[PDB]
Design a binder for this molecule. Structure first.
Ligand SMILES: C[C@@H]1CCN(C(=O)c2ccc3c(c2)nc(CO)n3C)C[C@@H]1C(=O)O
Length: 167
């Protein structure tokens, strides 16, 4: 039993809700919140900009030190950093950005990072400003993640389309 509330159950391990992931995180304080990161951990917009703003830019400060030490992430890769005031940890995961010409096939590799954590709050990878079909993202998520994932879809209209179309 966990403290997530109001989710619709899609499969044995995947759940989905119309929610602002920032507000879900502040309420639940999950062990892991997933960020829709880029390889530079430049949290400018989308979910990343929103999460970082909620941390008063502490996420960006920590991220800049991470990059200075380690260099950029791989597309499809991830790193674990602090969750600041939102969660114990933030798993920064790089889904491919279709608006950069990045291979959509790497989306499965991106979701595989979720399997290293028993429970996560997460957005649909490569959706929103990353330019991929959020319906496809949900499909890859369900077919790749085996751990317990609580998916927040900010846009109510998209959420209804995701649920109604889910096979
Ligand atoms: C699936 C699709 C992809 C990208 N995406 C975002 O970039 C995103 C997420 C949360 C955000 C946000 C932008 N802007 C704010 C305002 O502070 N918040 C709380 C989520 C979006 C969705 O779930 O509808």
């Amino acid at each position: 039993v966990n403290s997530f509330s109001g989710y619709l159950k899609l499969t044995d391990n995947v759940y989905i809700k119309n929610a602002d992931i920032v507000e879900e995180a502040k309420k639940v304080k999950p062990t892991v919140v997933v960020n829709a990161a880029n390889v530079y951990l430049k949290h400018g917009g989308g979910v990343a900009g929103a999460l970082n703003k909620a941390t008063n830019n502490a996420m960006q400060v920590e991220s800049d030190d991470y990059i200075a030490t380690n260099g950029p992430l791989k597309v499809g890769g991830s790193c674990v950093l602090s969750g600041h005031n939102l969660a114990k940890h933030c798993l920064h995961v790089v889904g491919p950005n279709v608006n950069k010409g990045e291979d959509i096939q790497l989306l499965k590799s991106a979701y595989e990072n979720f399997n290293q954590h028993e429970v996560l709050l997460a957005p649909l990878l490569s959706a929103g400003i990353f330019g991929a079909d959020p319906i496809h993202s949900l499909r890859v998520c369900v077919d790749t993640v085996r751990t317990n994932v609580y998916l927040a879809v900010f846009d109510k209209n998209l959420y209804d389309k995701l649920v109604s179309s889910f096979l």
